């Protein structure tokens, strides 16, 4: 209970009296590559103390051993820090080597030399941040004040009481302690929410913090479900508060519109044919099975019988015959029931900015996240990778302003071009039944193919599985095994390997409905690592990548196999 | 004088008529030196403030300077030595580039014994110097490189006999954009050199010999000119150059 | 920015062979003339600086080459290398000029 | 002559109206191509779907018949920039990204219709002239006439304007004004 | 000075530094009055500066009031031929007379820019309609130079109401021009 959500305010004039000076730079945030929404939120953060004129610098870091090696380059006039992303699962004392007793230079409680914030939202906690330290201190929504009721208790209570009844509390207390832990992980909130909140607590609320708002949590759709599910009414309610006003006479050159319009689970409607929209869709090929030649013929058949001619669906959306366009609604619901599809219909947000063109929130976050995949003796060779995937941040960065329209452009070619290697990807995994059932977890290791070094990129893994778990979770066999995904890289000859979760149907009830799946690959792999010497490189901010040598890779899996937990 | 406004108007239109003028104008003596000593005063007040409030800081770990009635003016301060400074600094290397251009006829000029014009008023000491050892640099590396291997009947890097020219002189009839301000503070029945026209305020007159002609310049208007009929009331004030 | 050119740190825009050696000394001279202009009445003045008039009290900038930490009037700037800065502009000018910042 | 006063405004108020950012781009391009003698406009298909969707679909659907319009207001455009009068009609040239058609692919069902498509050259004929301002004079009684004609596919009247024959006129090819037309062969 | 050109003619950056260093109407949002830190310029006078009260009408120099504008302490009120009526007054009367310029103050296209890009809520009118304005007069005013310009000679030109930007943009033509016209008039003398 360090920050509630309602003390968020306080925190921030803490920035504005230690921080805010015009003659020194004295505020840092470390920030969480190959993430959208921690971008978004650093975005808004920048803007913020842009307008009240405190100096601030940005720096992306990759892994917890570039923090922990930037961390000791830091002087002592950097009086605040601000993590984006991460830091709340470890404990940063221990691994900072943080001496409280070091850090008090205001002696009086102890007002200490440095103030570390936190603002993450992986769950879940760790107990020594959130009860025990005074130096980091942490942005909460809401998750301590009721999950974490007797942990509180158990906490202090065991080191403030630290003949028969002891013997016995000690060890019935530390077998709660220990059953907080050896849980998954998931995610249960957004950052780009939290801030958005601290500017309504401030009340600094405009069209473009809102903006950001929404392209943050929209990117939580796809693996997330239930939080954007949670957090999308009051989405809506803050966008009809800042309507500008009834009865827009004309359209301006300066004019912007953020409107809620009905949009589909389509993939790049508006920049693409209808056709591609509906080939290249993760939903439409779990529903359709369009990797082989009978989702094709199946897909022909519905577009022959919804009334539209084939030669006029292959054309762009710009030229496409406006009848057609006009009477879309009607002829997607009463034509989506036959083929199980009528999922594909939502509501979403538009935004519009003079005589340019409309772009929905799910185009944006496509073009951001492409932007981040691809833009611009062994050891070099992944510094490298590591240098350019925190080159790529600015890249991805520049396409938020509303200057650089061109870079927007390109992201949407390049997640054009993404898309369509994925699926080529998958149809040949897919028809060679490469997938092996195991009894505790499914394995598929990429050993030989075409364009390999695109998954060399975790989110370029990250879209493949995806789209093998969309693919799955609609197939009539009922199972939940998490899964193993494994690619090589001839150069470093090591193999990228990333577990992933399972997922229920898009369309499925919510009686099932609960915390989703819990991540267990990230302790597993710490138990494997410690009791052996494997060359494994756990360093990712994500537990659930790792980089194995490629002769580790056979003997490794075997002993997961009898790990467990999985 | 004694008007800090005044100084920073002086300086500003000396830098504009330097910039668009062919020739080499005389130096400001005094408000140069008043500029650099209000300079180099200000600066050390603004580093006196900037000491006591960092001082006073670290003593009892007190609160740093109140953010209301504080930053505003020292930026302000700060801002407005770095715009000073760049305009002193452009008017120096521009009339530095001008002194580059013209040093054979500068040497001529202070060699001559009935010229009028002399080096101690046209030109700061500073730029004395630096006229003195370009001069010299420049001689030898000409002398070195070609023009040891010539006849002692020409071996002069100034020669005002030979078929062409070698020193070479501002152009005393480059046409320049000016503006009639008038009188240069008023009482326009004072100044004998303005004369009334029909239905119109007062003009001044000029001649130009080469056309032989009259041209009138009325107040208020812009005028493309030759720089030689001008010169005088570019001295005086009359007309500024645009 | 003055300086004794060749013999010190460059900017590498001119390879040393291509001058001829009177050239070469006239650029020592002409360097060290500079020099002594720099020190004289003109301290306050830095008449090798830039000649863009300021208009943008602060800036965004963003760093080109990896460095250390570089002390500074009243502060410190660590330069990490892709990371982006928003300071004010009197203070990076000397960074940009030597190439290790961009943009403005 | 209700419907076309309207479409020649819409179509001024599109020259003279579009902005992107801080600079109306088509209004400068006809001032920097009547400068260097270039009478031409070129427009991008896009601004015009993004400025407002009826004028697109009313040029997509009557090309022959709206084209002329836009000719005249470039033209009622220029001579307000340029001139507070030797300035011929304007053309527009027109871009467009939609999908490229075969050559093969074109029948019956793309009559008067805009299209795209590509192909190769083949030959070039020799530059013949057409007629645009004609002075007309009768045989009879021998006044003077004049008529207008645009290229977007007319004959003299079949009747005498004040006993004269039948069609009685004939061109008085002085005073009369004519432009290049060129054929060419794809494949 | 001497890179970049620079020799004889002022770059647009100077020309905006020679305008942002004039003075400008503003309504305080803070009140700095004495009580019953100073701000002691050097180039301006600061006496406005130090005694600033709420809600009532001052004057500073312009990059004050930008500075002040970039916090949320200022309010910059446009010059009063920022307004449509007074656009249009001087449109017609430019189409009217078609041998002189209309009378502007020598910094309104430099002014009307920097207003616009720093000072958007100000303005009492849409902007989109004062920017279309604008234009419009400077078409009409490139036309009547364009004429203008056959009219070069080697003795001299009035251009009575050219603004600064203008001047500008056409000073290295129209000098050399003359300047080669007036050595062809002096050889044959
Ligand atoms: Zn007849």
Redesign the interface.
């Known amino acids: 209970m360090y920050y509630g959500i309602s003390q968020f305010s306080e925190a921030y004039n803490k920035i504005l009296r230690n921080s805010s000076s015009h003659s020194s730079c004295q505020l840092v945030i470390f920030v969480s590559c190959l993430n959208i929404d921690a971008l978004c939120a650093t975005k808004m953060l920048s803007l913020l103390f842009k307008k009240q004129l405190v100096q601030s610098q940005i720096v992306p870091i990759f892994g917890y051993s570039e923090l922990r090696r930037h961390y000791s380059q830091l002087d002592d006039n950097i009086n605040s820090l601000l993590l984006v992303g991460f830091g709340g699962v470890i404990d940063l004392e221990a691994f900072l080597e943080i001496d409280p007793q070091e850090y008090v230079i205001d002696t009086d409680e102890q007002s200490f030399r440095r103030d570390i914030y936190v603002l993450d939202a992986h769950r879940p906690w760790n107990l020594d941040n959130i009860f025990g330290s005074q130096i980091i201190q942490c942005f909460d929504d809401g998750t301590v004040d009721d999950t974490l009721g007797e942990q509180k208790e158990a906490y202090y209570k065991l080191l403030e009481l630290d003949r028969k009844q002891r013997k016995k509390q000690i060890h019935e207390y530390e077998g709660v302690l220990e059953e907080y832990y050896s849980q998954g992980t998931t995610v249960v909130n957004s950052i780009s929410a939290q801030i958005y909140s601290l500017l309504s607590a401030i009340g600094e609320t405009n069209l473009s913090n809102l903006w950001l708002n929404i392209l943050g949590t929209t990117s939580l759709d796809i693996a997330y479900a239930q939080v954007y599910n949670r957090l999308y009414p009051l989405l809506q309610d803050e966008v009809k508060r800042l309507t500008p006003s009834s009865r827009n006479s004309v359209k301006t050159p300066d004019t912007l519109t953020l409107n809620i319009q009905p949009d589909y689970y389509l993939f790049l409607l508006r920049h693409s044919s209808l056709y591609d929209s509906f080939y290249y869709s993760n939903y439409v090929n779990a529903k359709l099975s369009l990797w082989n030649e009978n989702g094709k013929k199946r897909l022909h058949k519905m577009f022959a019988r919804m009334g539209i001619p084939l030669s006029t669906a292959q054309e762009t959306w710009l030229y496409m015959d406006h009848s057609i366009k006009r009477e879309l609604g009607i002829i997607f619901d009463k034509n989506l029931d036959r083929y199980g599809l009528q999922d594909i219909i939502r509501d979403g947000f538009v935004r519009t900015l003079g005589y340019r063109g409309s772009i929905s929130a799910s185009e944006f976050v496509e073009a951001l996240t492409a932007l981040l995949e691809v833009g611009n003796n062994s050891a070099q060779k992944l510094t490298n990778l590591r240098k350019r995937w925190v080159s790529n941040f600015w890249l991805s960065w520049d396409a938020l302003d509303d200057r650089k329209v061109e870079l927007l452009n390109r992201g949407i070619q390049l997640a054009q071009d993404l898309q369509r290697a994925i699926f080529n990807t998958g149809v040949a995994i897919l028809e060679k039944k490469l997938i092996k059932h195991l009894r505790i977890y499914r394995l598929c290791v990429l050993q030989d193919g075409p364009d390999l070094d695109l998954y060399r990129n975790p989110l370029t893994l990250l879209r493949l599985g995806n789209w093998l778990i969309e693919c799955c979770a609609e197939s009539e066999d009922k199972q939940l095994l998490p899964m193993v995904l494994a690619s090589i890289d001839e150069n470093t000859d090591t193999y990228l390997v990333a577990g992933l979760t399972p997922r229920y149907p898009r369309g499925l009830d919510t009686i099932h409905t609960k915390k989703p799946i819990l991540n267990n690959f990230s302790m597993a792999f710490q138990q494997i690592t410690a009791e052996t010497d494997a060359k494994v490189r756990i360093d990712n901010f994500e537990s659930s990548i790792i980089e194995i040598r490629r002769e580790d890779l056979s003997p490794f899996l075997e002993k997961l196999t009898l790990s467990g937990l999985l | 004088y004694v008007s800090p406004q005044q100084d920073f108007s002086d300086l500003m239109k000396s830098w504009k008529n330097e910039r668009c003028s062919p020739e080499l104008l005389p130096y400001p003596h005094q408000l140069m030196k008043r500029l650099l000593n209000r300079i180099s005063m200000q600066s050390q007040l603004i580093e006196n403030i900037s000491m006591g409030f960092l001082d006073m800081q670290n003593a009892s770990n007190a609160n740093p300077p109140m953010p209301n009635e504080s930053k505003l003016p020292l930026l302000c301060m700060e801002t407005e030595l770095e715009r000073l400074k760049f305009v002193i600094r452009s008017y120096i290397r521009c009339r530095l580039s001008k002194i580059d251009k013209f040093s054979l006829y500068l040497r001529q000029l202070n060699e001559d014994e009935n010229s009028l014009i002399s080096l101690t008023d046209l030109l700061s000491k500073d730029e004395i110097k630096y006229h003195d050892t370009h001069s010299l640099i420049w001689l030898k590396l000409v002398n070195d490189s070609i023009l040891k291997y010539m006849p002692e009947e020409l071996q002069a890097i100034n020669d005002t006999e030979g078929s062409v020219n070698m020193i070479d002189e501002p152009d005393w009839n480059k046409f320049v954009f000016i503006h009639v301000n008038g009188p240069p503070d008023g009482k326009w029945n004072e100044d004998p050199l303005l004369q009334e026209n029909e239905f119109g305020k007062p003009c001044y007159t000029v001649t130009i010999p080469d056309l032989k002609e009259e041209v009138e310049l009325t107040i208020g208007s812009i005028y493309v000119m030759r720089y030689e009929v001008i010169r005088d009331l570019l001295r005086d004030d009359k007309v500024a150059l645009i | 920015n003055g300086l004794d050119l060749m013999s010190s740190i460059t900017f590498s825009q001119q390879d040393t062979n291509n001058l ?1 050696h ?2 070469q ?2 650029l020592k ?2 360097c060290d ?1 500079i020099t002594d ?1 720099k020190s ?3 301290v ?4 090798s ?7 943008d ?2 800036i965004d900038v ?1 760093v080109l080459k990896d460095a ?2 570089i002390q500074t ?6 330069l ?1 290398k ?7 502009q ?1 203070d990076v000018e000397r960074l940009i000029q030597q190439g290790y910042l961009q943009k403005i | 002559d209700d419907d076309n006063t309207e479409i020649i405004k819409s179509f001024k108020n599109f020259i003279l109206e579009f902005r992107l950012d801080s600079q109306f781009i088509y209004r400068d391009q006809l001032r920097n191509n009547i400068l260097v003698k270039n009478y031409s406009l070129t427009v991008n298909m896009e601004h015009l779907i993004g400025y407002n969707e009826d004028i697109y679909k009313k040029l997509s659907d009557e090309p022959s018949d709206i084209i002329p319009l836009f000719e005249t207001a470039i033209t009622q455009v220029a001579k307000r920039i340029s001139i507070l009068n030797s300035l011929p009609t304007f053309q527009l040239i027109l871009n467009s990204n939609a999908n490229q058609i075969p050559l093969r692919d074109l029948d019956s069902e793309h009559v008067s219709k805009i299209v795209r498509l590509s192909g190769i050259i083949i030959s070039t004929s020799v530059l013949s002239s057409r007629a645009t301002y004609l002075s007309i004079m009768c045989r009879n009684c021998r006044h003077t006439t004049s008529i207008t004609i645009n290229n977007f596919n007319v004959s003299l009247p079949r009747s005498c304007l004040s006993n004269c024959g039948p069609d009685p006129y004939i061109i008085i090819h002085e005073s009369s004004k004519f432009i290049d037309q060129q054929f060419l062969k794809l494949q | 000075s001497l890179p970049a050109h620079l020799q004889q003619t002022f770059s647009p950056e100077e020309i905006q530094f020679i305008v942002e260093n004039e003075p400008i109407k503003i309504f305080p949002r803070i009140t700095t009055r004495q009580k019953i830190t100073r701000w002691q310029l050097i180039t301006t006078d600061d006496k406005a500066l130090n005694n600033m009260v709420a809600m009532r009408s001052t004057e500073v120099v312009l990059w004050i009031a930008l500075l002040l504008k970039q916090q949320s302490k200022c309010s910059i009120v446009a010059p009063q031929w920022l307004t449509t009526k007074e656009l249009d007054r001087k449109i017609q009367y430019e189409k009217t007379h078609p041998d002189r310029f209309s009378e502007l103050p020598w910094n309104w296209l430099v002014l009307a820019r920097i207003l616009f890009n720093k000072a958007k809520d100000d303005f009492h009118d849409p902007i989109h309609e004062l920017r279309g304005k604008i234009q419009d007069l400077r078409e009409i005013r490139q036309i009547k130079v364009l004429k203008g310009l056959k009219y070069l000679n080697e003795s001299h030109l009035q251009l009575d109401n050219l603004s600064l930007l203008e001047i500008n943009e056409l000073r290295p033509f129209i000098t050399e021009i003359m300047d080669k016209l007036r050595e062809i008039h002096t050889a044959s003398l």
């Open positions: 001829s009177q050239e000394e006239y001279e002409y003339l202009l004289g009445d003109l306050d003045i830095d008449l600086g830039s000649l863009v008039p300021p208009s009290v602060f963003r250390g930490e009037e009243y502060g410190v700037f660590n990490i892709d990371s982006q800065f928003f300071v004010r009197s």
